[PDB]
Design a protein around this ligand. Structure first.
Ligand SMILES: N#Cc1ccc(Oc2ccccn2)cc1
Length: 284
């Protein structure tokens, strides 16, 4: 059923809350035993958001291999994403270790450091060229190379150095800066442009490790980003673009990380983004 017609049917009936709860009811439930170990309590921002054991990212160290991050592997679409929480003061070094070990080219950030007058994640990147950051626990160095500030997002070029081997890599930071404190954007126009800006970069492409995507918990806005990307790519390689079932794609992604899409407004916004993004893909 063409999703644009399904959309108008849900909107006219005002059943967004009822659709959303059906997804919550059918979603996968797998063990998260490593996340709940007492040694890992200060590695978790929220007590109710944990990565499943089967899909969690492991740090390459014998001490403690735990980070709040999950590998989402989509098969027909042939895309991988790592979805993680906003780093904590004690997990900034773990975060950059993961970016290094997984060979990621891009980091996507969908939140501000402060929202609603509270801290949503640590200041984990350098703000000035001449004041670089060193993470002593993971032996990494991070330098701001350049910054391009636009109206809806900022792109930063960073240099990450493995102080152990003296190899360096260029990491692109894509920072979406205008998601509102409450609700969802009124139009998906600025959100879709941003995805194409990550796309254009090569950060989503198979010659690199998976893109690292985060918000505060790494399920809400982060969920919206990878659901829209995957839906639009399937609409491209399939004879009938109308086959694409946004809900069934979202249940496949919830097999890898719990809670993706946190509200009925985020679910509606995901529909709008895919519907709009498809008009300039089906050849416009
Ligand atoms: N990559 C990918 C992917 C494609 C399809 C998926 O689920 C369905 C199932 C039946 C009809 C439509 N979509 C889930 C993931």
């Amino acid at each position: 059923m063409e999703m644009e017609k399904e959309f108008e049917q849900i909107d006219k009936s005002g059943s967004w809350a009822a659709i959303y709860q059906d997804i919550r009811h059918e979603a996968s439930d797998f063990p998260s035993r490593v996340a709940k170990l007492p040694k890992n309590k200060n590695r978790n921002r929220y007590r109710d958001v944990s990565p499943f054991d089967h899909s969690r990212i492991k740090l390459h160290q014998e001490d403690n291999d735990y980070i709040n991050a999950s590998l989402i592997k989509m098969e027909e679409a042939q895309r991988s994403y790592i979805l993680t929480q906003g780093p904590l003061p004690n997990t900034v070094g773990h975060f950059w270790e993961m970016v290094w070990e997984q060979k990621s080219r891009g980091v996507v950030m969908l939140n501000r450091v402060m929202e609603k007058g509270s801290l949503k994640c640590a200041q984990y990147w350098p703000q000035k060229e001449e004041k670089e950051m060193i993470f002593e626990d993971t032996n990494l160095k991070l330098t701001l190379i350049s910054e391009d500030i636009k109206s809806y997002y900022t792109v930063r070029q960073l240099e990450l150095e493995n102080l152990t081997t003296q190899e360096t890599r260029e990491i692109l930071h894509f920072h979406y800066t205008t998601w509102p404190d409450f609700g969802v954007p009124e139009s998906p126009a600025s959100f879709l442009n941003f995805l194409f800006k990550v796309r254009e970069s090569g950060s989503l492409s198979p010659e690199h490790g998976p893109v690292v995507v985060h918000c505060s918990a790494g399920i809400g806005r982060s969920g919206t980003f990878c659901l829209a990307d995957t839906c639009l790519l399937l609409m491209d390689k399939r004879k009938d673009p109308s086959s694409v079932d946004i809900k069934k794609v979202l249940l496949e992604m919830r097999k890898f990380r719990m809670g993706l899409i946190q509200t009925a407004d985020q679910l509606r916004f995901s529909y709008l983004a895919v519907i709009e993004g498809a008009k300039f893909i089906m050849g416009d």
